[model samples]
Target: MQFSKMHGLGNDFVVVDGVTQNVFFTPETIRRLANRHCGIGFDQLLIVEAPYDPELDFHYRIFNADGSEVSQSGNGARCFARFVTLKGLTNKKDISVSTQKGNMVLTVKDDNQIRVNMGEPIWEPAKIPFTANKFEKNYILRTDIQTVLCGAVSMGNPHCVVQVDDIQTANVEQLGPLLESHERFPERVNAGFMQIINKEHIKLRVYERGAGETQACGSGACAAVAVGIMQGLLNNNVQVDLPGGSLMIEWNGVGHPLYMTGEATHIYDGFITL
Candidate 1:
């Protein structure tokens, strides 16, 4: 099968064009594709399939390295637009895509930056699937190692963003899984560690639910900024620096849609045998 390897801020993916390629992508096949040594290493696999509806340009599905399907992905949306355009699947600079969670609009911008309309941020704890009586700026999560205050937001997917003093010294590996699987979040969650550099800049590390620690998490960036702004720590626009690279996030406030701007790169293309 012909496949393209793509990434946005170091969050790599193996994109399969299902429009023309006929392959049975079982969970077993996905697990093989995500293997670093045995297969093409990637945080997730993106499959571009024909849209089921006429209003949309196309449809895409996201699968984690462990072969579990996910609702939404910010970085994957950018790369999805890049792939369909550059590979001759679509001619429009702006494309509409449907994920399991909701619809997203992708715009191809100058300087290789892709603009994503990440839709609205969900604050309802029941919708975020958090078992909270009411909304709060931050919640105290008691882990075996430490008790942390995390700000919660839902960017289609659930996220628990924690504040850290030092980006380099934060215990992301240990704390990420603890919060992600915490009982409070029935759906599980993405654990985001954010170190504020200033009001405008911050460093982030995300332990994704199914992908573990990746170079970047697009939804995680928006969730962090969404929570940060609500907490009165950041402005409408903020630059989030992830271990993979950086992204510019803009959000006015509640009821306003969030914007994620970043770069999507094509590493190379190769054929993988099934």
Candidate 2:
């Protein structure tokens, strides 16, 4: 199979063109492929297929390193935009793509920064699949170790954003997994540690669902900013600094689409045997 390795802020992926190449992966196959030493190392595997809807540019699918199929990925979407255009699959600067969740609009800017309209943030507990009696800005989640205050939202996928006083001191290793698999979240959740620098900037670290601590998590940044805006702690445009680099997130407020802008870098292209 022909595959291209790419990354957006260091959250790397192995992208395969399912449209041109026959690609199918079982969970076991995915797990094996995710092995760093034994196989191609990636946080997720991106498969680009012919669009089911002819009006769309392409159909994209995401699989975590653990082999679980997911509905949405912010970074993956940006990479998808770059991949298709770079590989000569499409020439349109602005294009629409469909995912398991729904359709997304991708714009390849003149400066080469990919901007994704990440759809609306879902706050309803039933939709977010987070167990809660009512919708609140903050939800108290109790883990075996301690109680955590977090905001629950879904950027097509579920996420729990925990605000911290200090980004560097946040107990990400201890709190991330605990909240990720916390019983309250039926579908599990991406855990984000966010520390507000001001109204326009913040630092974040994310433990992605199915994928461990990644260098960056695009949807995680959106989730954090969504919660921060609702809590009156952040402005509409915020710069999110992650371990890998930075992402510019723009959200006007509730009922608006959040835009995530970042750089997607192609590492290399290789042919692999599965």
Candidate 3:
């Protein structure tokens, strides 16, 4: 199989042109591709397919390192946009694609940044699928390691956003697994540790569901910014700094779609047969 490797921030993906190639990835195959020791070693794999619907530009797929298929991936969306445009698959700057969760629009900026319309945040306890009346102000969760009060949201996928006094000391590695598998989020969730520097800036660390503490998380960053805005701890427009890199997130409170802007890069190209 022929494929291109790419990244947005440090969140990398193995991009495949499913439109012209008749290929499907099983969990084990996906597992092998994501192996850093011997495989392509990506946080997730993003595949582009010809849209089944006439209104959509492409059908996008996301696979975690552990081989789980997810509904949405903010970083993957950006890299997908860049890949298609660069491959001459699309000529328009604004593109529509379908995800496991729902539909999304990707706009290629003149400056070369990719902008995504991440729909709106979902907060219903049952919807975020978090244990309700929810756990906030610090929930008492005993992850094989520690317990913490975690805020939550759903950007197509479930998420648990926690406020930390210092990101430096946040137990992202150990606590992430605990929160991700905690009973509160029936569907599991992305765990985010955030430290507010001010109204406009915040530093974050995310232990992603199925994919542990990645360098960056597009959706996790948006979830952090949404939770922060709802808590009145951040501005409508904020810069989310993750370990891999940073992304600019803008929201207009409830009912408005979150806008995420960041850069996507080409790393290398190769072909591997499974």
Candidate 4:
């Protein structure tokens, strides 16, 4: 099968175009393709298919490296936009793509940057699917001396946002796993650790369920800014710095949808015989 490797802020994916390629993949096959030592290493596998919506051009499905299907992925969407556009599958600079979660819009900018409309942030615990009664802007979660206030938001997928004093010293390996599987989050969640550099800048690290810790997370960045604004720590528009690079996130606080702008780069393309 022919595949293209891509990334958004270093969160990598192996994209397969089902529209033009005849390929069939099992969960085990996807897992094998995501293996770092043995196969193409990536945070997830993205499959492009013909759109179900008559108005749309294509549809995307996301699978974590572990082989679980996921509802939404921000980074993956950016890569998806770039992949289809570069391949001449779509000529429109602005495009709409459907996901299991909902429809997503993408705009291809100059310098190969792709901006995505990530939809609104859902704060209801039931919608976020957390066990809590009502959703607050930010909830205090404690683990020993580490008391962190987590902002819960849903970007088609669940995410918990917290601010840290230092990115280098934060205990991601120790605490990230616990928070992702916390009892409150019944369906599991993505954990984002953010360090505020200023009102306009912040640094983030994410522990994604099914994918573990990755260099960058697109939805996580959007959730981080949304939570920051709610907590009076940041503005509506801010730049989020991840281990891989940076992303621009905008949330106007009027229940408007969040917008994420960033770059998507093609690493290489190859085929694997199964």
Candidate 5:
């Protein structure tokens, strides 16, 4: 199979173009492809297909390393936009694509950056699907050693955003796993550890569901800033600094969809006949 490796702020994916390729994937095949040692390693596999929606130009699907279909993936969407544009699938700088979660609109910006309309923040506990009746801007989640305040939101998928006083001192190894598996979040969730440098800038670390610690998480960053805005802790436009790089997130309080702008690049391309 021919595959291209890509990343958006270091959150890597193995992209397979199904438009011109006849690669049939089974669950076992997907698992093998994501193996770090035995196969082409990646946080997720992105499949590109022809668009089902006539209004849109293409469609993409996201699968975790464990071969499970996920609702949405922000970083993956950015990479997909870049991949399709570069491959001559579409010439328009702005394009729309469909995913399991919903339709995502993306634009290829200047300087190789990709901007994504990640949709609105789902705050209702029922929509977020948390085991709770009401939603708060912040919730105190407990681990073995500490109880941290996590801001819960869903950008198609569940995310728990925790703010720490210091980015460098945050204990991700000790708390990330616990909160990701906490019973309160019926479905497993992505855990974000954030350190607000100021109202306009912040640092982040994320433990993604189905994938452990990664260099960055686009959706997680968006959710963090949205919660921050709701709590009057941050401005509408903020730069989210992750370990790999940074993403610019903007959400005006006017109940419009959140906008995430960032860079996406092709790491490498190779063929593996398994």
Candidate 6:
């Protein structure tokens, strides 16, 4: 199989062109490819396919390193746009792709930054699949370590964002697992630890669902920013500084699609026999 390696803020992926190549991945094979030492290490694997519907430009799928399929991915969407354009698969700067979640547009700006239209955030507790009587900006969750106060939202996937006084001292290793598997979320969630510097800047770290603590989590960044904006802690345009790098997120409150702007890096291309 011919494949390319790519990354957005260090959240790397092994992307394959499924449109031209007949390919399918089972969970077992996906796990094998995700191994850092023995395989092409990546946070997720992306498969790009020809769109079934004529209205869309292409379709794609995302799988976590642990071999679980997900509905949406902010980082993967950007890389998909660049990969398709660079490979001469598409000539347009604005590309529309369908995923498990639905269809969304990706725009490659003249400055070379990719912008993704992440559909409006899901706020209702039931929609986020968070166990709560009603909608609330923050929920109190009890864990073995301690009680946690967090904001829950879904950017096509569930996420729990906790505000920390300091990013360096946040108990990511201890609390990440607990919050990810907590019973409150029927569908496991990504855990985000955020340290707010001001209205325009914040630092974040994320423990992704199905994939552990990655250098960055694109969807997690969106979720955190959404929660921050709703809580009145952040401005519409905010910079999220993650361990790997940073992304610019813009949201105009409720009823608007959040935009994530960032750079995607092409690592290398190789052929692998499986």
Put down candidate 2 lDDT per residue, 1-274, tens digits, no spaces: 8999998777789999999887999999999999999998988899999996879889989998889898656658888999999999889988899988778899999999999999889999999999999999989889888898899999888999999999888998889889888889999999999999999999999988866687888889999999999899999999999998999999988779999998999999988887
In model 3, which regions exceed 4 Å deviation?
25-43, 64-72, 134-147, 268-274
RMSD of 6: 2.4
> Which digits, one per residue and each the tens of the lDDT, describe model 4 over residues 184-230?
88899999999999999999999987568877888888888988988
Off by over 4 Å in 5: 1-3, 27-43, 64-72, 142-144, 267-274
Clashes by residue pair, model 1: none
Assess candidate 5 and give its TM-score to the true structure: 0.86
Total colliding residue pairs, candidate 2:
0
For 103-162, candidate 5 gives per-residue lDDT tens digits of: 889989887888899888889987876777677877877778888887888888898888
Please list the Cα RMSD from the true structure of every candidate, rounded to 1 decimal place.
Answer: 2.3, 2.5, 3.0, 2.5, 2.7, 2.4
Error in Å for residue 154 of model 1? 0.4
lDDT of each: 0.88, 0.90, 0.86, 0.85, 0.85, 0.90
TM-score of each: 0.89, 0.87, 0.86, 0.87, 0.86, 0.89
Q: How far out, in Å, is residue 171 in model 5?
A: 2.4
In model 6, which range of ten residues has the least summed lDDT?
66-75
Candidate 2 clashes between residue pairs 3 or more apart in a chain or in different chains? none
> Residue 121 CA error for candidate 1 (Å)?
0.9
Residue 96 of model 4: what lDDT? 85
lDDT of 3 by residue, 40-103 (tens): 8988898898888999999888887888877656658888999999989999989999887788
| True-structure RMSD for candidate 2 | 2.5
The worst-scoring run of ten residues by lDDT in candidate 3 lies at 133-142
For residue 216, give model 3's deviation from the true position in Å: 1.5
Worst 10 residues of 1 by lDDT: 66-75
